[PDB]
Amino acid sequence: PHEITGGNRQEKLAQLMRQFESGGLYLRTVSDHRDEFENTFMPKLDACLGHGCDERYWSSATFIQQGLNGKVHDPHADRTGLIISADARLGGFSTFDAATANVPSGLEPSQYFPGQFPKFDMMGAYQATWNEDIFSVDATAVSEQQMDELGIPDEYRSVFDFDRIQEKMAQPRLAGREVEPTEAKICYQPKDVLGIYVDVDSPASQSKARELQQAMREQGFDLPFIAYRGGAAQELASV
Ligand SMILES: NC(=O)c1ccc[n+]([C@@H]2O[C@H](COP(=O)([O-])OP(=O)(O)OC[C@H]3O[C@@H](n4cnc5c(N)ncnc54)[C@H](O)[C@@H]3O)[C@@H](O)[C@H]2O)c1
Numbered sequence: 312p313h314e315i316t317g318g319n320r321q322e323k324l325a326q327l328m329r330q331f332e333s334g335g336l337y338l339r340t341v342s343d344h345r346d347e348f349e350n351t352f353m354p355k356l357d358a359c360l361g362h363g364c365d366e367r368y369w370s371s372a373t374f375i376q377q378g379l380n381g382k383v384h385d386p387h388a389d390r391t392g393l394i395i396s397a398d399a400r401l402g403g404f405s406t407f408d409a410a411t412a413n414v415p416s417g418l419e420p421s422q423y424f425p426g427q428f429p430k431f432d433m434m435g436a437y438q439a440t441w442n443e444d445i446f447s448v449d450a451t452a453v454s455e456q457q458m459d460e461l462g463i464p465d466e467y468r469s470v471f472d473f474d475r476i477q478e479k480m481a482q483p484r485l486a487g488r489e490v491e492p493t494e495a496k497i498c499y500q501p502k503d504v505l506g507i508y509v510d511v512d513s514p515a516s517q518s519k520a521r522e523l524q525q526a527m528r529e530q531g532f533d534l535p536f537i538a539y540r541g542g543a544a545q546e547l548a549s550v
Pocket residue numbers: 338339340341342343346351367368369370371372373384408409411413414492493494495
């Protein structure tokens with residue numbers, strides 16, 4: 312089952328640190344860890360084994376990387392989450408938290424993204440150009456040259472190659488200034504789950520993280536606890 316789990320706890324820890332100090336990786340926070348386990352992770356495991364479908368397929372995550380002072384999405388400071396391998400499938404990346412939702416009812420999920428991922432952020436581009444015509448185009452459907460004709464600055468264009476997210480985030484990373492949560496749509500597989508996110512200041516976060524980690528162990532996925540904040544990712548032995 313090692314081909315499905317992706318390694319033991321020590322191998323996953325070493326994997327996520329290596330990625331964190333290289334090109335980065337992903338962090339998906341979750342308000343309902345029971346739902347994430349039961350309705351996202353477990354269907355993905357069943358599909359890996361040949362049973363069900365990965366119906367949800369695409370999930371939101373933030374890009375994290377050593378030295379990048381990046382916030383995660385946790386408005387009430389009460390979330391746990393998953394540290395997710397850079398090898399998860401990328402459906403699109405934006406530096407803005409915009410309106411891009413999950414796969415809607417009745418839409419085919421596996422290729423909903425990148426096709427329906429906005430190729431640029433309309434709100435940011437409009438504030439920067441005051442170009443009315445931005446709202447007369449389908450942002451999911453424009454090409455590079457249409458974006459040029461609209462005058463869309465590159466700062467507002469989405470990224471579709473993982474290796475290129477770190478180039479996008481290079482200037483914020485160097486300045487050390489806190490950046491708002493960025494957002495990627497990713498399709499993670501069970502083997503891509505490398506760690507459990509813990510906010511060490513939050514009793515809610517730790518209680519939820521302990522339950523999620525125990526639930527994952529029952530399926531043979533033994534994950535390290537990872538305290539991420541402010542461009543540092545550090546292990547917690549327990550809790
Ligand atoms: N979660 C992150 O790390 C992250 C990162 C960047 C931006 N955001 C933004 O935060 C807001 C909340 O997003 P979120 O990811 O916390 O919630 P979500 O959309 O992933 O899940 C919300 C709720 O819907 C269900 N759900 C979970 N995954 C689902 C899926 N794939 N399809 C359908 N239903 C699903 C569960 O009940 C869950 O509690 C959104 O605006 C999002 O763009 C979140």
